[PDB]
Symmetry: C2
Subunit: 414 residues, 2 copies
Amino acid sequence: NSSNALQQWHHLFEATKRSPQAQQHLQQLLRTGLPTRKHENWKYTPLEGLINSQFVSIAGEISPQQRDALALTLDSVRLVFVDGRYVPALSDATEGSGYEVSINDDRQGLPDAIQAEVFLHLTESLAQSVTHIAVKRGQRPAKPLLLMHITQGVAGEEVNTAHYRHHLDLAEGAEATVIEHFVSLNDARHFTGARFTINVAANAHLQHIKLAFENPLSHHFAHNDLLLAEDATAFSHSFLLGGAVLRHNTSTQLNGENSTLRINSLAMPVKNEVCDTRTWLEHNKGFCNSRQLHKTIVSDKGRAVFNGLINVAQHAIKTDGQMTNNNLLMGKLAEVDTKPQLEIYADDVKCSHGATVGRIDDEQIFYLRSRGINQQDAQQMIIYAFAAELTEALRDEGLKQQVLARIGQRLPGG
Amino acid sequence: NALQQWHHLFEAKRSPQAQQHLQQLLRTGLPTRKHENWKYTPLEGLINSQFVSIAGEISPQQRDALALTLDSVRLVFVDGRYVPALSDATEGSGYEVSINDDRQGLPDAIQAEVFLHLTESLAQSVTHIAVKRGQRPAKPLLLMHITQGVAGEEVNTAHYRHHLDLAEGAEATVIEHFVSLNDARHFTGARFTINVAANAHLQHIKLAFENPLSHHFAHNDLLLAEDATAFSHSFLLGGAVLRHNTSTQLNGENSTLRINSLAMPVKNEVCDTRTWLEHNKGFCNSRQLHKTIVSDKGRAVFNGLINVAQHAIKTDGQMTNNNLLMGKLAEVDTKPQLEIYADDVKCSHGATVGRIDDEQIFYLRSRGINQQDAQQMIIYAFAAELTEALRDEGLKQQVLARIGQRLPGG
């Protein structure tokens, strides 16, 4: 039952040395509790597979070879985390990289949550350490920072759970690209929780990429926060291509004028999967431009869920915000639920949103088939083209090809 | 204390159906600002009031003073009660009408909710309307509602209930008209349910034109069979707080549906326009256009749910909500909810929020058109796609006049 899952997580919390901040989030976890399908934000995302499980929290050890077999081919400053723990022996040295990094459980400097919710509190409470990352004023690291997360399940019916917590501060004029990569060690199911919070100061430029590529049976529940000051730029691209049930939130505050924001995501549930991609955006100051593109491709008995809220505060004049959610359904058993929302309290603004749902039109495939292209190839071409606005945002070609290959595994004919 | 008072109004006999809705009402209770569907619609101004139920008497002169200029089959309702002395003959009009409190033939609600239950439980009678197979009445049916408040702090409440059945091949236009007798505040509840049979064609128009201080909470149901057509146009231009729901089921193939609404909250008004639509069978086309014009300190709320059932192939459904904000303290909250369980469909939703660009005003000013005339032209143009739906030119002008009262210098 619901209380049982909470009881077990509560037990794991008290198993350890918890910070005052994690204690506060534990209290909030218990005050908020777990939701039912009647809750406003949980009508379409099942928790039964999680709630009815017995949990464990074991931190294993892997070799360099096991890391390499799961790793992305990319020139980066790579930090490796295994079953909720930073592993120095598998990580790159950070001194002189342009990234100031300290892993510890001191949380006095972390900002408050933008949008509190149950799984954010769970991850805050259970994470055993925080990855404190900082890029100093005007610094532009030569290589992107890669956060590689390797989580494994245990044999039997128990569900191993690992919760990761990182914070990045980009000081004024700093420019950096950070990549989150999540993989499973094997086919055993696990429950991954994650929370990456980022502060972007004046004139700073952030490029954030999330690659959620865990196995087909696991649960992935994450909530990232983006806090932007004035004259700031932030782009976040999420490729949610792993897990049986995944629910990712990106909450953002535009707390300064003249900033630019883009938040995109791709979801491609297959089999009996549920992929839930959500955003919460607050235009608290005027003169900011935001653009969101969330595309989904749903096959088999899959279900994609989109939720996007944009709140424009009073007097946030010259706000220019757009949100688009395009959903492609493949097959008569596919499902998609979408709720793009607007709360607009300023008049001198340009705000709009749109959501579309359909399948590959016979008319579009007709012109590929007329050239002799077979059905599966034609469908793959159309799907890649549908995802192209999102995958073309990946500057590194090598990285882009790897993401395209992960997409390829979910296409008709693979 | 609202529930307790409403409960007492009920027991003050009542049909078993009304008893069932009251039971559900008390079981569901009143929602808070934390409820999924009530984040933006205030109930304080209503909940913290003392309710009464007084059925006042009105003269034909008072009726004519508030009545629309239109040739129709007019039925007049005053303070929750049908008034035969002020109504037209229905016998021989093309509309089979029976007014009583028998409710065994009424269909189940498409989307049960608190205020629908309240209106079902408190309505004192049901207007049973039917158009026989293949028939097309010469004049439209007009349901005119006249509600008045009482002197003092008490809030008079009146709940209206009507059901229209369009038999196979039947075609009809029905208009709901709501007005206030004077400036006194009242609480109006309404529920118009309509069954559209195979090959039947419905034209529904709602004109909610009550005073600035009243509360109007309504919920209409539209049920369509196969090869049916239904167009519903709502002009929500009255009340301090208005919340109108239209719930619809497309339960037959090859049907066409259009649901439009106009909302223009001013002062400190809240105008909440909501739709719930189920494409239960395939091959149906649905289109919705909801436009709002929000003045300073006003608040418009839009909520539109579209659910497309599994195997409802060839569904073609669109929903558009355009919002024009006219001042720095205007507010708009808009929430579509698409639940699509069929792949071979074309479904989309779009919403826009913005204001009149100063450059457009300046351009007009440079061409000899002043600010007020420029604003009025632009606002009327924004509402035009909705107002042009009114076939009767005489009726369209009266609606445009009501719109005009809310424009700069109106």
